[PDB]
Amino acid sequence: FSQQIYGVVYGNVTFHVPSNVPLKEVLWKKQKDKVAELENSEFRAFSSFKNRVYLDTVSGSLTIYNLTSSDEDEYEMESPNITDTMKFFLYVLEMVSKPMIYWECSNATLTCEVLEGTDVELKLYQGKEHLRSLRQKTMSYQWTNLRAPFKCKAVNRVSQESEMEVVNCPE
Numbered sequence: 058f059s060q061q062i063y064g065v066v067y068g069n070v071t072f073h074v075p076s077n078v079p080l081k082e083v084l085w086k087k088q089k090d091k092v093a094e095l096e097n098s099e100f101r102a103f104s105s106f107k108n109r110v111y112l113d114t115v116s117g118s119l120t121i122y123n124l125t126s127s128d129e130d131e132y133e134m135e136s137p138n139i140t141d142t143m144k145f146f147l148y149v150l151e152m153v154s155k156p157m158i159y160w161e162c163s164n165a166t167l168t169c170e171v172l173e174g175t176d177v178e179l180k181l182y183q184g185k186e187h188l189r190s191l192r193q194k195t196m197s198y199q200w201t202n203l204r205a206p207f208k209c210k211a212v213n214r215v216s217q218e219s220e221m222e223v224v225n226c227p228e
């Protein structure tokens with residue numbers, strides 16, 4: 058088992074583990090270090106996870122609260138009567154802010170940019186047409202026409218915001 062999980066800074070995520078036969082004990086590790094456990098009928102969390110994790114005693118599912126970038130990592134769940142691995146790679150992303158659109162009339166160049174966001178992609182549209190996408194926080198485009206306004210969308214795994222603007226240039 059392997060799973061890709063996307064969380065937001067300061068938010069939380071739950072690593073859902075197949076719930077059938079209740080687990081008697083369960084151990085969660087972040088890389089090779091202990092995160093939390095249900096051992097000998099007692100619960101305990103370790104290091105940075107004390108006070109910010111919840112462990113489902115039935116399924117063994119782990120919930121991590123108040124995510125921070127350091128939390129981005131591979132996590133593994135183990136239980137005595139569970140043969141196979143339960144691996145989860147958690148990515149912690151900051152949400153995108155609203156994109157800004159500006160232009161230069163002289164060289165008919167339109168630029169879109171966005172300040173905040175992790176692994177952001179900017180997508181540009183004019184009318185109902187998707188003109189381009191770039192995995193960057195700034196993207197420029199030389200326009201051929203101004204028959205419709207431009208829409209720029211900033212998107213990442215955990216969020217998205219867009220801005221729409223009409224270009225004002227002398228004909």
Ligand SMILES: *[C@@H]1O[C@H](CO)[C@@H](O)[C@H](O)[C@H]1NC(C)=O
Nearest residue numbers: 067068069070071121122123
């Ligand atoms: C955990 O995140 C969810 C959305 O993913 C949110 O509804 C909830 O408020 C958060 N839990 C806590 C305790 O803040």
Ligand SMILES: *[C@@H]1O[C@H](CO)[C@@H](O)[C@H](O)[C@H]1NC(C)=O
Nearest residue numbers: 066067068109122123124125
């Ligand atoms: C989350 O952690 C940050 C510091 O890293 C701080 O805002 C606070 O300790 C936590 N926030 C909440 C709502 O628990």
Ligand SMILES: *[C@@H]1O[C@H](CO)[C@@H](O)[C@H](O)[C@H]1NC(C)=O
Nearest residue numbers: 160161163164165166197199
């Ligand atoms: C002109 O267009 C180029 C790209 O074609 C761009 O790099 C530049 O910022 C624009 N503005 C000016 C004043 O040249």
